[PDB]
Amino acid sequence: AQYEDGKQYTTLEKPVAGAPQVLEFFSFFCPHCYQFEEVLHISDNVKKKLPEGVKMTKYHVNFMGGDLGKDLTQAWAVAMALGVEDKVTVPLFEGVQKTQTIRSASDIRDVFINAGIKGEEYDAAWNSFVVKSLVAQQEKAAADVQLRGVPAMFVNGKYQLNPQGMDTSNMDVFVQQYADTVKYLSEK
């Protein structure tokens, strides 16, 4: 057919009960993730084509960047808890990968301060139990799909996107194919 298991997507041997409807994993250390977010805008184009009533979830992962990697998962939890993802995503990617000015938890914090999040508000969130469980949620979700690489996207805990089985020609065709594949899996 047009969409085939093993082509644009794969199927989890071990489906995940209760998973988010559309679940994306990434790392601010991940060069392909920088591309996905800053150049290709995958998340954004996927959302734009999702059916009514399907929510998009994006989690950070630990297994890149060592200690700073773990700090970034907690800071992403802070971004989620405060709802400021759209204000820190670009400066975090650029501070880690472009300017390489993010080398510590303090530098991560600077990005939020510069983005207008108050110090008190950031530190209170950072140390909160609500953020601790948001960290564990991200980690649980990653563990549940036996995640070994990013970027990655999963639909309904049953399917994993397989971008390698899409042509890279024109980036835009790749992006819309990705988006369309998610929409198809969504309706499946």
mmCIF file of C-alpha atoms in Angstrom:
data_model
loop_
_atom_site.group_PDB
_atom_site.id
_atom_site.type_symbol
_atom_site.label_atom_id
_atom_site.label_comp_id
_atom_site.label_asym_id
_atom_site.label_seq_id
_atom_site.Cartn_x
_atom_site.Cartn_y
_atom_site.Cartn_z
ATOM 1 C CA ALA A 1 0.000 0.000 0.000
ATOM 2 C CA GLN A 2 0.913 3.678 0.433
ATOM 3 C CA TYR A 3 1.478 3.507 4.190
ATOM 4 C CA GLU A 4 3.160 0.215 5.184
ATOM 5 C CA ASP A 5 4.386 -1.115 8.534
ATOM 6 C CA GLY A 6 8.174 -1.164 8.331
ATOM 7 C CA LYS A 7 8.177 1.749 5.921
ATOM 8 C CA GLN A 8 7.055 5.154 7.241
ATOM 9 C CA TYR A 9 6.443 3.728 10.689
ATOM 10 C CA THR A 10 7.012 0.655 12.789
ATOM 11 C CA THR A 11 4.759 -1.107 15.272
ATOM 12 C CA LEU A 12 5.656 -1.692 18.901
ATOM 13 C CA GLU A 13 5.918 -5.366 19.718
ATOM 14 C CA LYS A 14 5.014 -4.242 23.211
ATOM 15 C CA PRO A 15 2.328 -1.513 22.960
ATOM 16 C CA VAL A 16 2.142 1.045 25.750
ATOM 17 C CA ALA A 17 -1.145 1.392 27.630
ATOM 18 C CA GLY A 18 -2.274 4.903 28.555
ATOM 19 C CA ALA A 19 0.380 6.700 26.477
ATOM 20 C CA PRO A 20 -0.107 10.266 25.170
ATOM 21 C CA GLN A 21 -1.770 10.435 21.742
ATOM 22 C CA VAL A 22 1.240 11.968 19.989
ATOM 23 C CA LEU A 23 4.493 11.759 21.892
ATOM 24 C CA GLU A 24 7.759 13.331 20.721
ATOM 25 C CA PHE A 25 11.144 12.782 22.376
ATOM 26 C CA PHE A 26 14.140 15.065 21.971
ATOM 27 C CA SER A 27 17.343 16.353 23.540
ATOM 28 C CA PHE A 28 18.796 19.871 23.403
ATOM 29 C CA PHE A 29 22.148 18.067 22.773
ATOM 30 C CA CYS A 30 20.782 16.251 19.751
ATOM 31 C CA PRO A 31 21.980 17.716 16.420
ATOM 32 C CA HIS A 32 19.183 16.031 14.437
ATOM 33 C CA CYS A 33 16.741 17.403 17.060
ATOM 34 C CA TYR A 34 18.125 20.932 16.503
ATOM 35 C CA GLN A 35 17.420 20.395 12.804
ATOM 36 C CA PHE A 36 13.892 19.002 13.496
ATOM 37 C CA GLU A 37 12.965 21.959 15.647
ATOM 38 C CA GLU A 38 14.813 24.987 14.324
ATOM 39 C CA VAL A 39 15.091 24.210 10.577
ATOM 40 C CA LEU A 40 12.429 21.622 9.683
ATOM 41 C CA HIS A 41 9.842 22.618 12.332
ATOM 42 C CA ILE A 42 8.480 19.056 12.571
ATOM 43 C CA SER A 43 6.458 19.554 15.795
ATOM 44 C CA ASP A 44 4.734 22.579 14.409
ATOM 45 C CA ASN A 45 3.760 20.999 11.084
ATOM 46 C CA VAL A 46 2.576 17.810 12.758
ATOM 47 C CA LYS A 47 0.240 19.816 15.053
ATOM 48 C CA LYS A 48 -1.160 21.835 12.175
ATOM 49 C CA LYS A 49 -2.398 18.604 10.584
ATOM 50 C CA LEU A 50 -3.637 16.640 13.624
ATOM 51 C CA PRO A 51 -7.400 15.847 13.795
ATOM 52 C CA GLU A 52 -9.614 17.664 16.299
ATOM 53 C CA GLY A 53 -9.060 16.601 19.905
ATOM 54 C CA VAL A 54 -5.626 15.002 19.655
ATOM 55 C CA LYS A 55 -3.058 16.646 21.932
ATOM 56 C CA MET A 56 0.688 16.763 21.240
ATOM 57 C CA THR A 57 3.211 15.920 23.949
ATOM 58 C CA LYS A 58 6.951 16.517 23.832
ATOM 59 C CA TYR A 59 9.473 15.140 26.359
ATOM 60 C CA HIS A 60 13.199 15.679 26.934
ATOM 61 C CA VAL A 61 15.565 12.730 27.475
ATOM 62 C CA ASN A 62 18.549 12.032 29.717
ATOM 63 C CA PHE A 63 20.827 9.786 27.732
ATOM 64 C CA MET A 64 22.632 12.583 25.898
ATOM 65 C CA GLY A 65 24.910 15.139 27.479
ATOM 66 C CA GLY A 66 25.549 13.443 30.804
ATOM 67 C CA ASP A 67 24.995 15.619 33.854
ATOM 68 C CA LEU A 68 23.863 18.607 31.798
ATOM 69 C CA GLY A 69 21.505 16.317 29.910
ATOM 70 C CA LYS A 70 19.761 15.482 33.192
ATOM 71 C CA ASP A 71 19.655 19.185 34.134
ATOM 72 C CA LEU A 72 17.979 19.887 30.802
ATOM 73 C CA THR A 73 15.259 17.286 31.425
ATOM 74 C CA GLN A 74 14.507 19.000 34.718
ATOM 75 C CA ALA A 75 14.531 22.420 33.075
ATOM 76 C CA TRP A 76 12.158 21.158 30.408
ATOM 77 C CA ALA A 77 9.909 19.961 33.244
ATOM 78 C CA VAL A 78 10.093 23.571 34.548
ATOM 79 C CA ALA A 79 9.187 24.838 31.062
ATOM 80 C CA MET A 80 6.193 22.483 30.994
ATOM 81 C CA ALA A 81 5.018 23.293 34.535
ATOM 82 C CA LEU A 82 5.140 27.040 33.773
ATOM 83 C CA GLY A 83 3.887 26.765 30.181
ATOM 84 C CA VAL A 84 6.833 28.643 28.656
ATOM 85 C CA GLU A 85 8.044 26.045 26.155
ATOM 86 C CA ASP A 86 7.621 28.477 23.238
ATOM 87 C CA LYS A 87 9.927 30.984 24.903
ATOM 88 C CA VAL A 88 12.830 28.763 25.942
ATOM 89 C CA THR A 89 12.992 26.118 23.204
ATOM 90 C CA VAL A 90 14.980 28.271 20.720
ATOM 91 C CA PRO A 91 17.430 29.841 23.210
ATOM 92 C CA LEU A 92 18.060 26.426 24.809
ATOM 93 C CA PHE A 93 18.834 24.746 21.456
ATOM 94 C CA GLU A 94 21.086 27.658 20.463
ATOM 95 C CA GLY A 95 22.799 27.981 23.837
ATOM 96 C CA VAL A 96 23.646 24.288 23.825
ATOM 97 C CA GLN A 97 24.426 23.813 20.122
ATOM 98 C CA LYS A 98 25.036 27.163 18.413
ATOM 99 C CA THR A 99 26.764 29.532 20.840
ATOM 100 C CA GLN A 100 27.702 26.723 23.282
ATOM 101 C CA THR A 101 27.142 29.134 26.136
ATOM 102 C CA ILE A 102 25.145 26.588 28.137
ATOM 103 C CA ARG A 103 27.554 24.558 30.209
ATOM 104 C CA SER A 104 25.863 24.441 33.610
ATOM 105 C CA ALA A 105 22.509 24.507 35.416
ATOM 106 C CA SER A 106 23.129 28.195 36.082
ATOM 107 C CA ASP A 107 23.479 28.898 32.343
ATOM 108 C CA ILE A 108 20.245 26.998 31.716
ATOM 109 C CA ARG A 109 18.606 29.208 34.351
ATOM 110 C CA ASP A 110 19.965 32.343 32.613
ATOM 111 C CA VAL A 111 17.988 31.443 29.496
ATOM 112 C CA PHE A 112 14.752 31.504 31.523
ATOM 113 C CA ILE A 113 15.710 34.771 33.273
ATOM 114 C CA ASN A 114 16.519 36.349 29.882
ATOM 115 C CA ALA A 115 13.188 34.976 28.577
ATOM 116 C CA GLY A 116 11.368 36.879 31.309
ATOM 117 C CA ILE A 117 10.700 34.112 33.815
ATOM 118 C CA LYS A 118 11.375 35.521 37.272
ATOM 119 C CA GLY A 119 14.228 34.021 39.292
ATOM 120 C CA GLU A 120 11.988 33.259 42.265
ATOM 121 C CA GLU A 121 9.440 31.626 39.996
ATOM 122 C CA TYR A 122 12.060 29.545 38.197
ATOM 123 C CA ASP A 123 13.799 28.409 41.394
ATOM 124 C CA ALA A 124 10.503 27.547 43.129
ATOM 125 C CA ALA A 125 9.502 25.422 40.098
ATOM 126 C CA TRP A 126 12.972 23.833 39.761
ATOM 127 C CA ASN A 127 12.790 22.555 43.334
ATOM 128 C CA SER A 128 9.081 21.625 43.279
ATOM 129 C CA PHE A 129 7.633 18.142 43.634
ATOM 130 C CA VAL A 130 5.313 18.895 40.731
ATOM 131 C CA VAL A 131 8.496 19.226 38.633
ATOM 132 C CA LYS A 132 10.005 16.060 40.190
ATOM 133 C CA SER A 133 7.069 13.976 38.910
ATOM 134 C CA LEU A 134 7.173 15.697 35.519
ATOM 135 C CA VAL A 135 10.792 14.538 35.315
ATOM 136 C CA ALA A 136 9.698 10.975 36.262
ATOM 137 C CA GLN A 137 6.865 11.109 33.694
ATOM 138 C CA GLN A 138 9.323 11.998 30.917
ATOM 139 C CA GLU A 139 11.649 9.236 32.053
ATOM 140 C CA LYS A 140 8.791 6.672 32.369
ATOM 141 C CA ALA A 141 7.470 7.426 28.901
ATOM 142 C CA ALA A 142 10.971 7.042 27.433
ATOM 143 C CA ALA A 143 11.527 3.746 29.300
ATOM 144 C CA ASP A 144 8.114 2.407 28.242
ATOM 145 C CA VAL A 145 8.970 2.570 24.543
ATOM 146 C CA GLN A 146 12.515 1.330 25.198
ATOM 147 C CA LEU A 147 13.815 4.585 23.693
ATOM 148 C CA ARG A 148 17.419 4.446 22.356
ATOM 149 C CA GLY A 149 17.626 7.446 20.078
ATOM 150 C CA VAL A 150 16.158 10.863 19.406
ATOM 151 C CA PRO A 151 14.393 12.512 17.649
ATOM 152 C CA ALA A 152 11.531 10.091 17.943
ATOM 153 C CA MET A 153 7.771 10.200 17.718
ATOM 154 C CA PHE A 154 5.147 7.680 18.814
ATOM 155 C CA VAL A 155 1.423 7.583 18.115
ATOM 156 C CA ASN A 156 -1.041 6.149 20.682
ATOM 157 C CA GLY A 157 1.705 4.036 22.272
ATOM 158 C CA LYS A 158 1.509 1.649 19.322
ATOM 159 C CA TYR A 159 3.445 3.148 16.408
ATOM 160 C CA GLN A 160 6.890 4.712 16.035
ATOM 161 C CA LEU A 161 7.659 7.106 13.183
ATOM 162 C CA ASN A 162 10.342 5.847 10.788
ATOM 163 C CA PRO A 163 11.646 8.976 9.015
ATOM 164 C CA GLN A 164 14.496 6.996 7.414
ATOM 165 C CA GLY A 165 11.779 5.489 5.223
ATOM 166 C CA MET A 166 10.906 8.863 3.718
ATOM 167 C CA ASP A 167 12.986 10.671 1.046
ATOM 168 C CA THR A 168 15.120 13.697 2.070
ATOM 169 C CA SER A 169 15.078 15.464 -1.349
ATOM 170 C CA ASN A 170 13.407 18.612 -0.491
ATOM 171 C CA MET A 171 13.160 19.039 3.260
ATOM 172 C CA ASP A 172 9.600 20.328 2.988
ATOM 173 C CA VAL A 173 8.359 17.171 1.274
ATOM 174 C CA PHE A 174 9.991 15.199 4.057
ATOM 175 C CA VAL A 175 8.343 17.422 6.689
ATOM 176 C CA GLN A 176 4.838 17.119 5.172
ATOM 177 C CA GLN A 177 5.280 13.370 4.663
ATOM 178 C CA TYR A 178 6.220 13.106 8.325
ATOM 179 C CA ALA A 179 3.197 15.183 9.281
ATOM 180 C CA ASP A 180 0.890 13.197 6.995
ATOM 181 C CA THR A 181 2.186 9.911 8.355
ATOM 182 C CA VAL A 182 1.387 11.069 11.894
ATOM 183 C CA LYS A 183 -2.101 12.118 10.792
ATOM 184 C CA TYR A 184 -2.682 8.700 9.169
ATOM 185 C CA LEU A 185 -1.474 6.798 12.262
ATOM 186 C CA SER A 186 -3.603 9.146 14.340
ATOM 187 C CA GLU A 187 -6.751 8.076 12.483
ATOM 188 C CA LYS A 188 -5.785 4.392 12.502
#
